[PDB]
Amino acid sequence: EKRINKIRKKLSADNATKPVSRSGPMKTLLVRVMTDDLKKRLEKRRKKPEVMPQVISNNAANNLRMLLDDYTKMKEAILQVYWQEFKDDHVGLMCKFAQPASXXXXXXXXXXXXXXXXXXXXXXXXXXXXXXXXXXXXXXXXXXXXXXXXXXXXXXXXXGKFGQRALDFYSIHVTKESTHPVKPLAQIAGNRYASGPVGKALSDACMGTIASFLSKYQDIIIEHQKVVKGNQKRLESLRELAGKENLEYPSVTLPPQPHTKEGVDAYNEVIARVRMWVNLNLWQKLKLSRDDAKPLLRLKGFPSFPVVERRENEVDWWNTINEVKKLIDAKRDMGRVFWSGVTAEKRNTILEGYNYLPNENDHKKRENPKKPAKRQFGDLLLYLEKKYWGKVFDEAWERIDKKIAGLTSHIEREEARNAEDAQSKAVLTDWLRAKASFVLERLKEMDEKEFYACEIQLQKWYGDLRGNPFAVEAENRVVDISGFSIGSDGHSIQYRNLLAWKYLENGKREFYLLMNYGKKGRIRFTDGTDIKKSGKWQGLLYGGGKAKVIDLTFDPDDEQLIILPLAFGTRQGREFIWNDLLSLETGLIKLANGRVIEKTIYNKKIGRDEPALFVALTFERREVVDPSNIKPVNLIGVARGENIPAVIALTDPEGCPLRIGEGYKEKQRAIQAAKEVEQRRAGGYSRKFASKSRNLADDMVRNSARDLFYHAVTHDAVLVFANLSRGFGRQGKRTFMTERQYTKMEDWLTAKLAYEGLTSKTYLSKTLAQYTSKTCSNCGXXXXXXXXXXXXXXXXXXXXXXXXXXXXXXXXXXXXXXXXXXXXXXXXXXXXXXXXXXXXXXXXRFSHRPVQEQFVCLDCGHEVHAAEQAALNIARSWLFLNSNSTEFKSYKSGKQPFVGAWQAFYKRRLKEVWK
DNA sequence: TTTGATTTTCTGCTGCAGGATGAAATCCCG
DNA sequence: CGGGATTTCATCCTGCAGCATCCC
RNA sequence: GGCGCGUUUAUUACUUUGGAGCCAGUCCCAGCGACUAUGUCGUAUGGACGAAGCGCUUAUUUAUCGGCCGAUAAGUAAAACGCAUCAAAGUCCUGCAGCAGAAAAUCAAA
């Protein structure tokens, strides 16, 4: 009773079905074409299939490769010419891609004391359902709907929604008029593609991508206006130099609002320089806290133009290895007159301070631990100092150029046969940087001028040599199918695709995807009704509005007609190709859009080099259950977390009364431990588990979304989440992005409660998360006041004591927090409260949640898991928001704040109905 | 011993923003 | 004189929302 | 960690997550550690090598044995069958940015 396809047949077999209004919910397949090895994987099983299915017919793959290459070159040439358009008129391109308005009418005016920005912003009140007053400016009414007052009512210069088809792409480049000199069908593709589906699909993809860039760039210009004003306010550190009278000036003038992309890098170099000076002279040398000398903020988030402005720094490996070796052997003989030179102490000071001698690597972890291959050279230098400082440098050079020529004769014999050693590259680069930072120390003590150019050259070469043998080439190539629809003529396929299903021998189909992108016909059709056991070839082409099947006559030929067979499981077919409830060839599910994706899948025998051809048809629903369900006895309190996500508590609607996804953080920390082991040695990633973390995350998210939906439907529930303000995370030092999934569970539960009919108003509500998961279920803290005294506090009611066990190690330490209080209190108490912060010990012991699993109240004396008690309050906070009793009227009229109103609601209900 | 602040090279995962194109109207060519 | 390939065109949503929640 | 069977997820073979089965050794090159230090000995850290179900049939091959066969321990070669071995999930694309991981430099701090 646990499956997700039993709950949907419980939902859609209880209440009625309504057609959708304007659009529907969208799903999609992700199937794979039978390339070749999907036929090898069938003649290796025990039980062999009866009919060997089909493959790509060896000339469909050639045409598909030609189409994908020509499509990617066309899309790149269009984004090139619009990049050269965008680099001249930012506001010109922004005003070009604005939108049409719609088909409105005669609106008002507002030219009186209001224009636009950088041209006569009128006004109207269209949507009279609830919220009206959309601006809708003009000059083709560019819907300039914006402004949030704050400083001044500044409506946006271009629109609020950039659009896809605002440009009318197909009167420019593609058509045979329009002397704009870059026509991608007549120049690059070679005039052999139809100007029907290719031009419109290329319009779809290129205008979608440039509208994405512009609609991000507008918001980023506004946010940098705020951040540049805030950065100009934080040049009160120019006061802090005379506030301490010991620092002269940082001497850096901030450029204005940058607008381009290189202005951002210049302004960020200036903010980086002032931030480096602030950390060097005001957080360490004078020991100020961070909120006394606030740092300058960096301009983050500037979007670049999509495909034209990638990085492309690709270099070979062996040329940079020989370059590093040339730079090292150029400075050898001047590197002898320094190390056989200066003193007996300055050589020891350079060895000691610049991290050469082994500081503490002697802790045998049940052999000594490994060294970072700069201190191996320190051990060798110490031993060759002991047994043997003039002739030591020659004696410690020959045992490195035998460890470099020993490694470089191990790569070059194990790279140029078949394999990649993948660790003996990283140890060669580590040893070359150690020998580099050993030769160059004549420069970093004698004259520091040409050191930093040589140091930035060695840093660029080390970066190339460490990362570049692990970069991925071969980005994904894709070609759009923009719909299946019979045109205005009676029998002609617009957009030139189908979904074939050639009939097989017994009764079954084979589900091909015919593309016909050549500049001819070769696919035509009349109609069909019989199931004759051969190539009936039926088709599904949406004649007009209603769906239809046809019968289709064509010969598989070597001039067009890319015929891809599909290979999907029985589960994808049972869901949405031949489903019993929403049947195709009737109209309840319509197809909308297809692709052909050639992306990289990891093959088990070799590395990741295996491009396979996915298809990904996108399906829209058109039958949807109507809401006549209320779910009374409901109040399921989902209360999300990170150590154990989505802990559940169920309760009756008066208030009176599971650990879904139990072991998840341990698996993710083990996968990150495996990546951090294969990153310390062997500098890259070993790209097998470069897609393990997202796959495990999606498996847990969709399994727990199934479990929440099952517990919502069967126990007749209304899921009450907590308003975690989408995009919530720890965002600290050791948070990997996979463990940041409080938004994705709500997203998947909504996107499975949008499909199968409902909305986010009948099985998914949301309460406030303010002061939940902090109040005990028999008590009511917020303000830990140590105003009362250092022998005791008074807590809520009654009193308390002291005598503690305060644990705040950050090494291996603790206290007792009575002796600590006395030592930081002496015999004055109040003066110690004014000077020192003794509240840290109070909030280290007397705080709730001592270990980050449990929970102890301060007036109850209670102990519950703080997740099965974070859930019985989320369900009791939604029953406080929308239940107008007495104490929701208060905090709404403004008598009491939220904490006092909620505790006066709780301690009124916790004795009456245990709510 | 370990962490502040800049910087060089790679990677993955989430979080936004475009989307999920049919109907009609010309026009050329056998 | 129709068949079939090009070439234009154009759509729509309101909804209200308050200072912790995650974890260290 | 590696290698394979594969069942349930109410016409097919995809992408995955779980449970169960079988192997995890050799200093050949390297890494790393100790030193009796331009190398010797250890350590399986990476490459390269080999290890990777069982059982019932049938054609064989080695050896025992009952007077040209036939039963046996073991291997080869072939197809079907049973067991170990059982449950779940899928909404994509393009484009950026943001975080986080990783070393490696430079200036400093406790």
Query: Where do runs of H (alpha helix) occur along A468-607?
Result: 570-576
Q: CB neighbours (10 Å) of residue A707?
A: 17
Q: Residue A726 to residues A205, A640, A730: CA-CA distances in angstroms?
A: 28, 13, 13
SS3 call for A277: helix
Asked if A604 and A683 sit in the same domain, the reply is no
Q: Which residues contact A54 (CB under 8 A, 6 or more apart)?
A: A34, A510, A565
Q: Which residues contact A799 (CB under 8 A, 6 or more apart)?
A: A792, A793
Considering A411, A440, A470, which residue would you say is the last residue of a domain? A470
Q: Is the dihedral of CA A13, A14, A17, A20 positive or negative?
A: negative
Considering A470, A486, A502, which residue would you say is the last residue of a domain? A470
Q: Is the dihedral of CA A735, A736, A737, A739 positive or negative?
A: negative
3-state helix, strand, coil in chain A (%, to 5): 35, 10, 60
Asked if A454 and A547 sit in the same domain, the reply is no
Q: CA A637 – C1' C18 distance (Å)?
A: 21
Output b/e per residue, A764-790; b: 16+ Cβ within 10 A: bbbbebebbbbbbbbbbbeeeebeebb
Q: Which residues contact A206 (CB under 8 A, 6 or more apart)?
A: A75, A78, A79, A82, A169
Q: CA A40 – C1' D73 distance (Å)?
A: 38
- Resolution of the determined structure in angstroms stands at 3.7
- Residues in A 66-105 whose C-beta is less than 7 A from nucleic strand D are none
Q: Which nucleotide lies closest to A394 by the C1' atom and the CA atom?
A: D38
Give, as ranges, the nucleotides of chain B with any atom within 7 Å of a protein CB: 1-2, 4-26
SS3 call for A141: coil
Q: Which of A527, A518, A450, A458 is nearest to A486 (CA)?
A: A527
Residue A307 lies in a domain: no
What are the structure tokens assigned to A832, written together?
């110690």
Q: Which residues contact A313 (CB under 8 A, 6 or more apart)?
A: A464, A468
A618 touches strand D (CB under 7 A): yes
Full 3-state SS string of A696-746:
HHHHHHHHHHHHHHHHHHHCCCCEEEECCCCCCCCCCCCCCHHHCCCHHHH
Asked if A32 and A613 touch (Cβ cutoff 8 Å), the reply is yes
Q: Which nucleotide lies closest to A482 by the C1' atom and the CA atom?
A: B21
What are the structure tokens assigned to A25, written together?
């919910």
Asked if A162 and A214 touch (Cβ cutoff 8 Å), the reply is yes
Q: Which of A707, A702, A731, A729 is nearest to A717 (CA)?
A: A707
Q: Which nucleotide lies closest to A134 by the C1' atom and the CA atom?
A: C14
Q: Which nucleotide lies closest to A870 by the C1' atom and the CA atom?
A: C21
**How many angstroms separate the CA atoms of A337 and A339, rounded?**
6
Which DSSP string do the residues of A111-130 spell out, in sequence order? -TT----------B----SS
Asked if A611 and A655 sit in the same domain, the reply is no
How many CA atoms within 13 Å lie on the side-chain side of A429? Answer: 23
**How many angstroms separate the CA atoms of A224 and A268, rounded?**
12
Asked if A718 and A668 sit in the same domain, the reply is yes
Residue A325 lies in a domain: yes
Element (H, E) at A765: strand A764-767
Instruction: Determine whether A635 is exposed, middle or buried from the number of CB atoms within 10 Å of its CB (0-12, 13-18, 19+).
Output: buried
Asked if A304 and A407 touch (Cβ cutoff 8 Å), the reply is no
Asked if A505 and A604 sit in the same domain, the reply is yes
User: A613: which strand partners?
Assistant: A598
Output b/e per residue, A59-73; b: 16+ Cβ within 10 A: ebbebbebbbebbbe
Q: CA A102 – C1' C10 distance (Å)?
A: 8
Considering A600, A622, A644, which residue would you say is the last residue of a domain? A622
A721 touches strand D (CB under 7 A): no
Asked if A484 and A516 sit in the same domain, the reply is yes
Q: CA A673 – C1' D62 distance (Å)?
A: 53
- Residues in A 444-483 whose C-beta is less than 7 A from nucleic strand D are 444, 455, 459, 462-463, 466-467, 475-476, 478
Asked if A329 and A421 sit in the same domain, the reply is yes
Q: Residue A518 to residues A190, A195, A196, A202: CA-CA distances in angstroms?
A: 12, 10, 10, 15
Q: CA A28 – C1' D19 distance (Å)?
A: 30
Residue A291 lies in a domain: no
Angle subtended by helix axes A376-386 and A426-439, to nearest 10:
50
Q: Which of A715, A809, A709 is nearest to A749 (CA)?
A: A709
- Rg of chain A (C-alpha set): 35
What are the structure tokens assigned to A31, written together?
């199937």
Q: CA A483 – C1' C9 distance (Å)?
A: 17
Asked if A729 and A773 touch (Cβ cutoff 8 Å), the reply is no
**How many angstroms separate the CA atoms of A874 and A771, rounded?**
10
- Residues in A 488-517 whose C-beta is less than 7 A from nucleic strand D are 507-511
**How many angstroms separate the CA atoms of A432 and A723, rounded?**
53
**How many angstroms separate the CA atoms of A717 and A637, rounded?**
10
Asked if A502 and A437 sit in the same domain, the reply is no
Q: Which of A228, A203, A248, A215 is nearest to A296 (CA)?
A: A228
Asked if A644 and A728 touch (Cβ cutoff 8 Å), the reply is no
A244 touches strand D (CB under 7 A): no
Give, as ranges, the nucleotides of chain C with any atom within 7 Å of a protein CB: 3-16, 18-24
Q: Which of A425, A461, A463 is nearest to A326 (CA)?
A: A461
**How many angstroms separate the CA atoms of A566 and A499, rounded?**
10
Element (H, E) at A214: helix A197-233
**How many angstroms separate the CA atoms of A700 and A704, rounded?**
6
State which amino acid sits at residue A568.
F
Asked if A468 and A314 touch (Cβ cutoff 8 Å), the reply is yes
**How many angstroms separate the CA atoms of A436 and A196, rounded?**
60
SS3 call for A40: helix
What are the structure tokens assigned to A623, written together?
């039958």
Q: CA A53 – C1' D60 distance (Å)?
A: 36
Q: CB neighbours (10 Å) of residue A828?
A: 11
Element (H, E) at A806: none
Asked if A13 and A626 touch (Cβ cutoff 8 Å), the reply is no
Element (H, E) at A520: none
**How many angstroms separate the CA atoms of A814 and A820, rounded?**
10
Q: How many domains is chain A built from?
A: 3
Instruction: List, comma-separated, the residues after which chain A is broken, a break being a C to N distance over 2.5 A; otherwise answer none.
Output: 118, 139, 366, 388, 657, 780, 789, 791
Element (H, E) at A53: none
Q: Which nucleotide lies closest to A591 by the C1' atom and the CA atom?
A: B20
What are the structure tokens assigned to A879, written together?
């029953």
Q: Which of A69, A190, A170, A178 is nearest to A519 (CA)?
A: A190
**How many angstroms separate the CA atoms of A94 and A85, rounded?**
11
Angle subtended by helix axes A692-714 and A665-680, to nearest 10:
170
Asked if A139 and A120 touch (Cβ cutoff 8 Å), the reply is yes
Asked if A195 and A177 touch (Cβ cutoff 8 Å), the reply is no
How many CA atoms within 13 Å lie on the side-chain side of A520? Answer: 7
Q: CB neighbours (10 Å) of residue A98?
A: 25
The single-letter DSSP state of residue A33 is E
Q: Which of A37, A64, A151 is nearest to A563 (CA)?
A: A64
Q: CA A566 – C1' D11 distance (Å)?
A: 14
Residue A511 lies in a domain: yes
Q: CA A739 – C1' B7 distance (Å)?
A: 29
* Closest residue (CA to C1') to nucleotide B1 in the complex: A360
SS3 call for A329: helix
Q: What is the length of chain A?
A: 915
Residue A281 lies in a domain: no
A697: left (phi over 0), alpha (psi -120 to 50) or beta: alpha
Q: Is the dihedral of CA A230, A232, A237, A243 positive or negative?
A: negative
**How many angstroms separate the CA atoms of A131 and A121, rounded?**
19
Find the domain containing A548 and state its range: 20-55+476-622
**How many angstroms separate the CA atoms of A672 and A797, rounded?**
47
Residue A709 lies in a domain: yes
Pairing verdict, β A562-567 and A32-33: antiparallel
SS3 call for A604: coil
What are the structure tokens assigned to A652, written together?
């009756």
Residue A125 lies in a domain: no
**How many angstroms separate the CA atoms of A852 and A863, rounded?**
13
Asked if A607 and A653 sit in the same domain, the reply is no
Q: Which residues contact A471 (CB under 8 A, 6 or more apart)?
A: A314
Q: CA A900 – C1' D68 distance (Å)?
A: 107
State which amino acid sits at residue A237.
S
Q: Which nucleotide lies closest to A307 by the C1' atom and the CA atom?
A: D95
Asked if A753 and A672 sit in the same domain, the reply is yes
Q: What is the separation of C-alpha A897 from the centre of its chain, rounded to a whole number of angstroms?
A: 37
Q: CA A873 – C1' D109 distance (Å)?
A: 45
| Method by which the model was determined | cryo-EM
Residue A322 lies in a domain: yes
**How many angstroms separate the CA atoms of A435 and A22, rounded?**
69
Q: What is the largest CA-CA distance in chain A?
A: 101
- Report chain A's terminal Cα–Cα distance, integer Å: 31
Asked if A380 and A463 sit in the same domain, the reply is yes
Strand arrangement of the beta sheet that strand A764-767 belongs to:
A636-637, A719-722, A764-767
Q: CB neighbours (10 Å) of residue A351?
A: 19
SS3 call for A637: strand
SS3 call for A514: strand
Asked if A483 and A574 sit in the same domain, the reply is yes
